[PDB]
Swiss-Prot record, chains A, B:
This is Beta-ketoacyl-[acyl-carrier-protein] synthase III. It comes from Staphylococcus aureus (strain MRSA252). It comes from the Bacteria. The gene is fabH. Homodimer. It is found in: Cytoplasm.
């Protein structure tokens, strides 16, 4: 059967943080940051607003956009590396708060590739035929695990949440191809320091793997889908670093103007990155039914994901 | 198709802690901890040994018992609430440490019910026809999140790991029926306190829920399977506490000598609970090919699950 996105929702906190905000406690500057990452500002959730709070907002919209009631949700999967707690999970909270049925709800960790993994995981259940609507969320409150003494990561991450309803869609539309991967050998280059509680990154190592995986993984899902660079209406990669993005956009070999770019206003929001970017293209009327979009991302693990899907309910 | 367990393995740390150990800092006694929990002793991983390490040990056994090589694994799903770090995930670490391919690998959060969730997640992936040997793990080092000044839970939790390879089994064996559920209103009765980093539990509220949910869900999966307590060879519940286990067994109305009990030597090992108990029945000669068992558990969240599965490769 054809399984796709029949409902979409996104959300970014209200507090906007400009690049000029780090000059006070870091050797940075708008010029530097903009040049190095292509970021101009990011969104940060308040102290009393955790990952579940963002996840909740993103979910409510995708439920209305799918044109269904929360009672119709057959399962909840929240992709996040920053859940409020390991238990109860963010999905457990969405179950009660969304007023859904007492269906299965879990968070699956795959970092920045998490959303595609969950999106793909949901497809597997919907194909079993016993599941019609699965709520998939990609949410992260990275600001709470960001080291503000390490300018290369401090000025890089933001918070945000994205969400969709995976279920069967009209024929010809939906998920066409996808790819998931792991490489435990690169975990040391990007992890959460057990003691300190802060994220650790080796920019140069992470950078080199990022440009390659996102480039190649995308190429793979496109060929698997048997598509031509002509059939690609939008290339929506993990908004990790404008330079990483361009490099991968370049590797894939696709028009510079087909790439979704929202890293300038959100920064790197891990699992929310892709949905937060699809939200832009939708409300700027640049993504429409029957358009074919290419998804790709990677995160600390190292993990990666790539998807090919024709938009439409 | 018939999807079941084609390889099994379990592990528990070398350090065994006697009930009398807690007398030096808690007002307890062997008789008291027994009377209340039925636990006699449990295992605690070493200071330099994390969930990863436990997961690893069971995985090696599970792959060897399956009769395959690490290069045959198509995916790696790790169920835990005490993973080393949110990223990389325990799964990512196994991918490497196991010398597996660069296959998909992620951790899934559903507390003590996660192991069942994950086995089902794998079922869905195998039913697609694209996956054949999915390494699923149940691991937890509850000891690092247990508050020893709270004898309530201090004497309850222990560490350990369980693992299985999910694939296609013969002679119409494997998973017959299942039920995964969730209920976020109980999140307050069992959560990881953010500030303190220690597990917080409301005993009575969890007890009440546990007994009811295990008994009821078991009855449903059996009935959904068109069976009776007679056809069930073993009733293997989350070894959360001997008193909670008997109450459920009484509700399910199954034979007292059909219930698998291992809490006595492991205590509560969360996700590892059921696989750790299956390991005991296998070697004591109580579980054999073509036997029909019933798995059921519950956890913080709250979550719960139940499976009816005919043993056999």
């Amino acid at each position: 059967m054809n399984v796709g996105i029949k409902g979409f929702g996104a959300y970014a906190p209200e507090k906007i943080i400009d690049n000029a905000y780090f000059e006070q406690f870091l050797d940075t500057s708008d010029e530097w940051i903009s040049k190095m990452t292509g970021i101009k500002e990011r969104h940060w959730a308040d102290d009393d607003q955790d990952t579940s709070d963002l996840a909740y907002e993103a979910s409510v919209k995708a439920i209305a956009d799918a044109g269904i009631q929360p009672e119709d949700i057959d399962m909840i999967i929240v992709a996040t590396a920053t859940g409020d707690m390991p238990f109860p999970t963010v999905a457990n909270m969405l179950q009660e708060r969304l007023g859904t049925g007492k269906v299965a709800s879990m968070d699956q960790l795959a970092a920045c590739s998490g959303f595609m993994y969950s999106m793909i995981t949901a497809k597997q259940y919907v194909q079993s035929g016993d599941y019609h609507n699965i709520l998939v969320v990609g949410a992260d409150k990275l600001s709470k695990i960001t080291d503000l003494t390490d300018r290369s990561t401090a000025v890089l991450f933001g918070d945000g949440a994205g969400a969709v309803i995976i279920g069967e869609v009209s024929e010809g539309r939906g998920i066409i191809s996808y790819e998931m991967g792991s490489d435990g050998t690169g975990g040391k280059h990007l992890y959460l320091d057990k003691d300190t509680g802060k994220l650790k990154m080796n920019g140069r190592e992470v950078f080199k793997f990022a440009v390659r995986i996102m480039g190649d993984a995308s190429t793979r899902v496109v060929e698997k889908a048997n598509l031509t660079s002509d059939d690609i209406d939008l290339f929506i990669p993990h908004q990790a670093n404008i330079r990483i993005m361009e490099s991968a956009r370049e590797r894939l070999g696709i028009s510079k103007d087909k790439m979704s770019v929202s890293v300038n206003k959100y920064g790197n929001t891990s699992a929310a990155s892709i949905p937060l970017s699809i939200d832009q293209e939708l409300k700027n009327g640049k993504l429409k039914d029957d358009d074919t979009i290419v998804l790709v991302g990677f995160g600390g693990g190292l993990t990666w994901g790539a998807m090919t899907i024709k938009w439409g309910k």
